UniProtKB/Swiss-Prot annotation, chains A, B:
SUPFAM superfamilies: Tetrapyrrole methylase. This is Diphthine synthase. Keywords: Methyltransferase, S-adenosyl-L-methionine, Transferase. Homodimer. HAMAP family: Diphthine_synth (MF_01084). Pfam families: TP_methylase. Its EC number is 2.1.1.98. GO terms for biological process: methylation; protein histidyl modification to diphthamide. The diphthine intermediate is not stable in vitro and readily eliminates the trimethylamino group. It is not known whether the elimination reaction also occurs physiologically. The gene is dphB. S-adenosyl-L-methionine-dependent methyltransferase that catalyzes the trimethylation of the amino group of the modified target histidine residue in translation elongation factor 2 (EF-2), to form an intermediate called diphthine. The three successive methylation reactions represent the second step of diphthamide biosynthesis. S-adenosyl-L-methionine binds at L10, D87, V90, S115, I116, L166, A209, H234.
Length: 265, 265
């Protein structure tokens, strides 16, 4: 008679917590969505095998418009789980789903999992130094979203790092690369001309966090703009003022130009 | 020849990921540190039992001063694990440890786990709206730290939420409560008069994240300053202006007063 929101983690089926696995294994019905993010190292089958249950995948429409019609009814007489990539409530609108559950008289519980939001720690950038985050969305027709540019500007002025979630169109199997994000930012810079994002801007790229061998690279846009960072998902980070040790890690671990070791205090 | 940084997650021994557990079980040596944080929902014994490996606990000094002569030597000819609460490399100084590994000719890999940085998503507050984070430390002697007040001021001023970690004396097993943090902030407000933290400030308290029954409370300081939020650890958040959807979640899930739907939106 309950609903469990269970995160599956960053890259493969083993990124689920032990708590999440043991609970999922005992649920009567298991649903999931794979449109909010991409788990590049697993398949629905591998997940089903690990959990030992048939998994009904839902689309954004199924969830956003029919969650209370598809999932909640069953949670009133059974133990139901709703699986999602990463952490269920991070950079998704799934939190609001708990409100729907309450209104339907269904109790819900949240089982966390590793999230890209905290995985940024592997870049060596102090996580407390990150400021407001933003999403780089694909332009549509004549609509060209640019608010993420102002977020970088606001953070940079305060010496804070900017995390940039990248766009995803699961149904079209489109996953925005860090390269595409950099190209869009240069276009916005050309329009706004604020000196926020240029060829000399230092950026950090993290691809496939969660895998044992993620791609972690740091450098100037002019040099990374066309570099191959591997398969998606990717996130782009625009660091603010660096601490000496952040710079050292980027150089030693992310192959950044030794030049950044020298910081302008 | 390999060092694995493995996160133990948020609250109990089941918060480690499947990947983290399986890798730990295959390691010849397993070290752990519990000074950055403590798994309040479990014990060293239970973690040891789950992993099926003797766990050698390391102090802050063992790690910060002697990581290269305590952990790395063994990593040269064996597979070694270094367990930490939360997600590895979140603690400010841990990233640098990977530099030490490289310098020692030891390959290192990171196995992620849930971190409070992403788990706070359970408060219903959008992750992208969080700004710079900080820690509330106890005053002592002629030292009354209050920079965390400025962090709140700069974040709120830009409509951003402030995540506040509370002081902890690991060895003495003493946790600062949300109540104490609030009292301290009111004192800082009294000395700075910035109109940043007062009795009418809306705050959110998250205690025992990771647990299946966490305490999520939201309301004005005047009402929560003396409320019992249960056993530690406690996390305090001073939200910025709320999105109506954030407000509704706090009211419906965190028991916030209806008043926030008009006053803090
Ligand atoms: N393993 C991974 N590596 C790199 N970026 C990732 C990632 N997982 C998610 N992202 C980034 O975040 C976006 C999804 S946003 C949803 C995030 C998810 N709830 C979590 O907790 O991680 C992706 O488009 C990508 O830009
Ligand atoms: Na943050």
């Amino acid at each position: 008679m309950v609903l469990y929101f269970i995160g599956l983690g960053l890259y493969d089926e083993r990124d689920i917590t032990v708590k999440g696995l043991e609970i999922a294994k005992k649920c009567d019905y298991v649903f999931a969505e794979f449109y909010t993010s991409l788990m590049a190292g697993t398949t629905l089958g591998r997940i089903q095998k690990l959990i030992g249950k048939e998994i009904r995948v839902l689309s954004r429409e199924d969830v956003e418009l029919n969650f209370e019609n598809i999932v909640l009814p069953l949670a009133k007489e059974n133990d139901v789980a709703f699986l999602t990539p990463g952490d269920p409530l991070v950079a998704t609108t799934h939190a609001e789903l708990r409100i729907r559950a309450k209104r339907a008289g269904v109790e819900s519980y949240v089982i966390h999992a590793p999230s890209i939001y905290s995985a940024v720690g592997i870049t060596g950038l102090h996580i407390y130094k990150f400021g407001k985050s933003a999403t780089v969305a694909y332009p549509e027709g004549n609509w060209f979203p640019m608010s993420y540019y102002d977020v970088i500007k606001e953070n940079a002025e305060r010496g804070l790092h900017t995390l940039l979630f990248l766009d995803i169109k699961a149904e079209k199997r489109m996953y925005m690369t860090a390269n595409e994000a950099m190209e869009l930012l240069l276009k916005v810079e050309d329009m706004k001309k604020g000196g926020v994002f240029t060829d000399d801007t230092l950026v950090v790229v993290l691809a496939r966090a969660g895998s044992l061998n993620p791609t972690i690279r740091a450098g100037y846009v002019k040099d990374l703009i066309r570099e191959d960072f591997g398969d998606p998902p990717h996130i782009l980070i625009v660091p603010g003022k660096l601490h000496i040790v952040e710079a050292e890690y980027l150089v030693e671990i992310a192959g950044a130009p030794r030049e950044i070791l020298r910081v302008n205090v």
